[PDB]
Design an enzyme around this catalytic site. Structure first.
Site, mmCIF file in Angstrom:
data_model
loop_
_atom_site.group_PDB
_atom_site.id
_atom_site.type_symbol
_atom_site.label_atom_id
_atom_site.label_comp_id
_atom_site.label_asym_id
_atom_site.label_seq_id
_atom_site.Cartn_x
_atom_site.Cartn_y
_atom_site.Cartn_z
ATOM 1 N N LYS A 46 0.848 -1.346 0.241
ATOM 2 C CA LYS A 46 -0.275 -0.344 -0.156
ATOM 3 C C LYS A 46 0.388 1.070 0.254
ATOM 4 O O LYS A 46 1.330 1.436 0.989
ATOM 5 C CB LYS A 46 -0.668 -0.357 1.120
HETATM 6 C C1 LIG Z 1 -6.498 0.725 2.963
HETATM 7 C C2 LIG Z 1 -6.567 1.306 1.219
HETATM 8 O O1 LIG Z 1 -7.737 0.537 1.381
HETATM 9 C C3 LIG Z 1 -6.907 1.199 4.000
HETATM 10 O O2 LIG Z 1 -7.329 0.707 6.001
HETATM 11 C C4 LIG Z 1 -8.150 2.367 4.528
HETATM 12 O O3 LIG Z 1 -6.439 2.760 4.725
HETATM 13 C C5 LIG Z 1 -9.343 2.175 5.422
HETATM 14 O O4 LIG Z 1 -10.099 1.974 4.877
HETATM 15 C C6 LIG Z 1 -8.934 3.121 5.579
HETATM 16 O O5 LIG Z 1 -10.518 3.787 6.525
HETATM 17 P P1 LIG Z 1 -10.599 4.718 7.875
HETATM 18 O O6 LIG Z 1 -10.760 6.042 6.923
HETATM 19 O O7 LIG Z 1 -11.320 4.449 8.619
HETATM 20 O O8 LIG Z 1 -8.535 5.327 8.271
#
Ligand SMILES: *C(CO)[C@@H](O)[C@H](O)[C@H](O)COP(=O)(O)O
Ligand SMILES: *C(CO)[C@@H](O)[C@H](O)[C@H](O)COP(=O)(O)O
Ligand SMILES: *C(CO)[C@@H](O)[C@H](O)[C@H](O)COP(=O)(O)O
Ligand SMILES: *C(CO)[C@@H](O)[C@H](O)[C@H](O)COP(=O)(O)O
Ligand SMILES: *C(CO)[C@@H](O)[C@H](O)[C@H](O)COP(=O)(O)O
Ligand SMILES: *[C@@H](CO)[C@@H](O)[C@H](O)[C@H](O)COP(=O)(O)O
Ligand SMILES: *[C@@H](CO)[C@@H](O)[C@H](O)[C@H](O)COP(=O)(O)O
Ligand SMILES: *[C@@H](CO)[C@@H](O)[C@H](O)[C@H](O)COP(=O)(O)O
EC number: 2.2.1.2
Lengths: 223, 223, 217, 217, 217, 223, 223, 217
Positions: free
Chosen positions: C86
């Site tokens: 990521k």
């Molecule tokens: C990674 C990318 O898919 C995920 O873990 C995102 O960082 C989160 O879904 C973001 O969520 P929040 O807005 O609740 O931190």
């Protein structure tokens, strides 16, 4: 659009009222029981909310039968003219709403999940009807589509019952309620505070203040 | 639709007013610092614009705290009846708007980026709300869609706050604002000049003049 | 549509995986630092998730510079073939994605908030792009409209990057994602658990249970 | 669109198959218990329907636990190749569906009330999913909207699970299913017979008969 | 779009055939009983139409019972390979259509007034289905709506039954059928002739006639 | 979209062909008779157009009966393989189109004013069908709506007849034809020349050339 | 969607290419004259961009006559295989495009302001067509609607000419171009930089970094 | 909707006025210079139109400067109370309109090509604004869409300036103007003459003429 606070937390209500954008409060037995700990009694909580909030304060009966609901509603009414009696969408609830409406006691029909329930509450004379958008979202239907249908139905028949959008979970429930034209939203404190915020507001404010220090070292406006 | 000039350049303001196409002016701390160069004082610039301009003139407070904002607002109001106090969308800003509205001081809530911020400013009693369409365009969302939603929300509740479209960058922000029905646009001078112009206007004028020479060599209308 | 679980909570992941409805996992530095407490180390958490989850597991780099991002991405890739790196939507991130894509290391571009950022990430070759719908809701914009525009853009250009809807807060983000045609949603555990349930399912099951007892006590 | 009969009444089934417009049958515990009276046993009813109907015949498990559902399902399957095992939308049901699909046993997921439940059943590999439109109408939501959303979602992901519209109450559920493009409707016998009928068909037949007596006494 | 003539009048058919724009003929017991007067016999008329018309010609059974319809349909078939057997939308009619389709005898299901009747006829194997738009107009519903829905339903299921729009009363039935995409229209002779005509065609011819006289007397 | 020239004027055809955007020509007895003056004969005009134009050249029969139309069409065909025989929408015209279609002689059905006329011409096998949009505009119906319906009908049945929009009067007939997806437009010369022009093209070209003279006094590009 | 840089600033071009987000460059006589200041020759600037940039580089002829345009075009083509010859929408321009297309020289037709001009350029064989959306915005018509019509027209006829959206002024021109499905946008450098950015990206990065300090003081990922 | 005649041709105006369908006249310097030939003087032409036409008559100033425009506008006003001063959309023109509107001299702002120019003219107080639809058609933009936007803008702000559609080339500009709700159209004489006519009117009149002769030779 009126904005109510959906909480029994005194400190949250006090803070939001002091902001000047809170027009009333809704409570329910769960919200009150959350605050009725460490010695505090639910009667004190309700009376203190009624004192702090100029606008409507909705307080839910706990009886499920017609006679007990009407008796509780009259005691709630006696706590102050700004009290609103919250009554569930049931056969006995509709009978109670009709009786209380004749007595000029304001009412709020709760636990509404489709538009025809809302219409029946309006026909009984209710002051406010509260469809629960978050709990519909929970079961996989977009709860705002029920608000839209209720708005249309109520417009069709010039209904005077106010739509009070409840079970609100995020600021887009609030945006869509305003675009539809709902009369009232009731929001948890976390939602209310987020409504004033935007990253470009913070960025822009900081930038303006730095621009200003170039012509006014002290940062003041002298005129 | 009223059209304001978004500048503190005095030459621009005089030129625009004398076209009779300018109904007011907006300023902000940046725009004023641009003109407060080489001896010119910001107090002199504000007082002059208030003199030259018959319509509203929006002048922004620089304090971030409630007391500082109301104090500066009352001073701005004292400079002339056409002064409008520009106040950012913050907790203290909303409190300041409500107090000033009760004192019959006109206000303009600025740094608005979504429709619910605009609604909150209207609930506080603000005379004008200024959503920033160009800065929304900058971050990849079409800013005019926010104007469209605000116009719908305001229509729904018969809100009297005027929509003042700001951060305008091009003539299509202006065209779309008029089609939506925003109350006011405020535009930079180079956008103002462009609004009067079209290449077919220029061409057609030139042609009618040549056509008229076939009937009148001096190019005059002798009646 | 694939459904991923957005958590580093090993107990949540085990439960979701035992239900058979979890296709992958996303994490981020906040989620992992929520679990790496009271002795637990973040490296152990990541390795345990990689072991439990058969599907993709996204793990975010912490460096902000191209060189550090690629070096961290290579160590993540080496923890297991189902690891996905990521990478935030920044200038250095797009450079890193392009390098890692040429090295056949799967990537996920995160912190995306409008459709043109998502397109740039796709042009850099990213495997997945994660627009954040709940954080857009927070600031007063319907985040799902951004998913709708990205789907149209990706369809226009036959883009192979997968749309991974993130920052999901409720089951209607999930429903709207499926109706739009997003490739993946990643959901917190509370949301995941609600997706199977409906009160008329519960009611009907109880009723058939009583009906059957009439012919079979 | 395939048309199944939603009944365990052997006489209705025979009649409807004899018309040529019945492609299969669905049952449930209520429907079977209604005919398992006056000494008739449910095992014989199911066997009789299996013999009469060439097409799929959906028969519901009564166990609520995974292991009992899989064991029942295998027995239902042993009754004939056209048997389809009806399984409720629950965590254990999805687990049972995934196991049975890998054993090449056809399945029908029942008690579905929203589109994401239907998507989860398709992800488990179910042969048919049955959303209940009449029971949604009962609680004040237009059930056919759920079918329309499921059709879009399944088209988006090229899902092979067939949409089997159930809890049908009237011929407009049937008409709307066909315009949406649902794969199957299952209908009670009184709805089925009404589908062939129209007052102008009756009127037209009588006039042409009177017209024909002019040139042929 | 194919265009058929809806008549039993030999002179109309001959005239429209000479025009080269008539692809086939439909008849019914009313139309034929109108021409079998003053000594003319219906069996002669049918054979004469069959003889003149290269394309399909639909001839309606008069029996109302299955075995009689099937017997009559075989007699109609033997009259010429372009004969199509017109069968009403009834229980016995669907049964006969199915049997006749298995015998490779082409069929045309008539007296259809809604889309689900049309779907049932297609499921039984019918070659053509004829919804009656004019008779729906008569009772206050826009009959062309039914054609639109049948087109959508048949597209959804790749149905090979051809939509044969019947009971046509005016040229806008014809225009709308073509814009919807119906496979065939069958039209009365007055309607047919009108389709070629337009006052601006008449006017333009006359003016070009005068224009050419300036150059070639 | 193919673009034909709707004229018998040799100089116009020569000019438009030399531009490279003219794919063929349509004529009619009026257009030819306009050019058949001052000694010129209509046979010379047609033969000279056929020589200049590589693409289809549509030439109208003058007979109104089937036998004369087919005889004229065969003589027209003999003038060159690029000739197309223009035949009116009449009963005898449709019979002639069917006969000529079998003989592999290309045809163009003219004087079409609604979509079902166009469909009948396609069923007879015609190569091109020419609905007259300007003459519909003249009688108070928007002629482009007929092109839109014909496009839909022809798409429905995968019809291979080309839609040749005729009686064109302005560049918006041309724009709308292209957005609909008509196969061909045929345009008067005045319309064709306007299609390349826009005031912002002229303004921009002049400005670029002046910008260039700042770095290249001679105005050349040497590389 | 390909993204080109609309500049001749070499520093901008190098910076953009090294982000790997730039697929080509467009220039015009104005843009080049801006960089041909203080000794730098226009020939040197063109040759350098062709060197730095692996994708197409559009270079505009300055002759207005057919012969001058084809002559300059062949010289531009000789400087590198990635060179694309930019040719204005005029009678001579269309003739030059057809000839050059037959010589397998890539072309870009510029100064296009409506959809039929774009279609004519496609009919002449042009590799790219460049409608100018910002200059349409300037004269009060939404330039993106022209892009939408061109995309529909090109889809209708399976036209292979690429739509190169030009005169871009803001990120919403870019967003709308991608939603429509234009093949290419060409953007100024300050618009390019803005496309990567969003205030919630910045905020979220900063927050994850602080969150990571609670588990790792040095802010590194030790695997 | 008012219908004006866009010409300085006195013979055209007399004919149109005798029909009773002409509510006013617009002229411009080209139209007048077309008539002021072979001895005729432009001042005489303007005075003759003012006399013939009871309704508004627009006459354009030729000066380009504020002072000259107002002085010319005052002389035009003094030729007759139905005179309207046509003033181009320029900076000096808007200044002149504002001055003349305060002097209760009716004005018409011309050479308008987009909706914001029309709004500026209305803000200056102009009696009529004339957007040019045919000249927009010429440059490849549907000019009527500009009329549609001006109508919406004027409705939004309850603007009292009348929309006077000019540069009209055909009867569909007129039809679309009426459906939009423009206040006025001004049309060339050829267009005016076509508005009354339709070939089915001509046909039906001829037919009723023959029908009547059967009962009254
Ligand atoms: C990674 C990318 O898919 C995920 O873990 C995102 O960082 C989160 O879904 C973001 O969520 P929040 O807005 O609740 O931190
Ligand atoms: C005041 C609010 O009406 C205005 O001066 C605004 O500050 C500006 O219009 C904001 O524009 P920029 O985004 O260009 O600063
Ligand atoms: C056979 C079916 O295509 C046809 O002959 C139909 O009977 C007629 O089209 C029905 O027409 P009427 O409503 O005028 O009887
Ligand atoms: C070439 C065509 O692709 C480009 O350089 C164009 O000239 C410019 O994009 C035009 O932009 P401006 O309107 O800002 O000159
Ligand atoms: C005055 C304003 O209504 C009119 O005479 C206009 O000048 C003409 O209608 C413009 O027409 P042309 O475009 O044909 O000159
Ligand atoms: C009373 C009705 O206005 C409110 O207090 C409702 O009980 C709540 O808004 C319901 O919200 P939850 O679904 O989150 O309990
Ligand atoms: C099995 C699923 O296809 C069916 O038998 C369903 O149980 C019924 O269609 C449900 O209908 P009711 O709502 O009438 O029980
Ligand atoms: C032949 C058909 O393509 C053409 O020459 C037509 O006759 C003309 O286009 C008709 O135009 P007018 O209505 O202006 O005669």
């Amino acid at each position: 659009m009126k904005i109510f606070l959906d909480t029994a937390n005194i400190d949250e209500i006090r803070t939001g009222v002091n902001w000047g954008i809170v027009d009333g409060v809704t409570t329910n037995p769960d919200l009150i029981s959350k605050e009725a700990v460490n010695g505090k009694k639910y009667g004190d909580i309700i009376r203190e909310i009624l004192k702090i909030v100029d606008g409507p304060v909705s307080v839910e009966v706990v009886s499920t039968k017609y006679e007990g609901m009407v008796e509780e509603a009259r005691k709630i009414h006696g706590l102050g003219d700004n009290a609103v009696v919250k009554i569930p969408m049931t056969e006995d609830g509709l009978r109670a709403i009709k009786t209380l409406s004749s007595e000029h006691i304001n009412t709020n029909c709760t636990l509404v999940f489709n538009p025809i329930q809302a219409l029946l509450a309006a026909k009984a004379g209710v002051t406010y009807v509260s469809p629960f958008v978050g709990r519909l979202d929970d079961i996989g239907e977009d709860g705002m589509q029920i608000i839209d249908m209720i708005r249309t139905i109520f417009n069709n028949y010039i209904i005077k019952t106010q739509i009070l959008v409840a079970s609100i979970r995020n600021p887009i429930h609030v945006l869509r309620s305003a675009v539809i034209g709902a009369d009232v939203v009731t929001v948890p404190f976390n939602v209310l505070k987020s409504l004033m915020k935007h990253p470009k507001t913070d960025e822009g404010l900081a930038k303006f203040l730095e621009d200003w220090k170039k012509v006014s070292p002290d940062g003041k406006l002298i005129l």
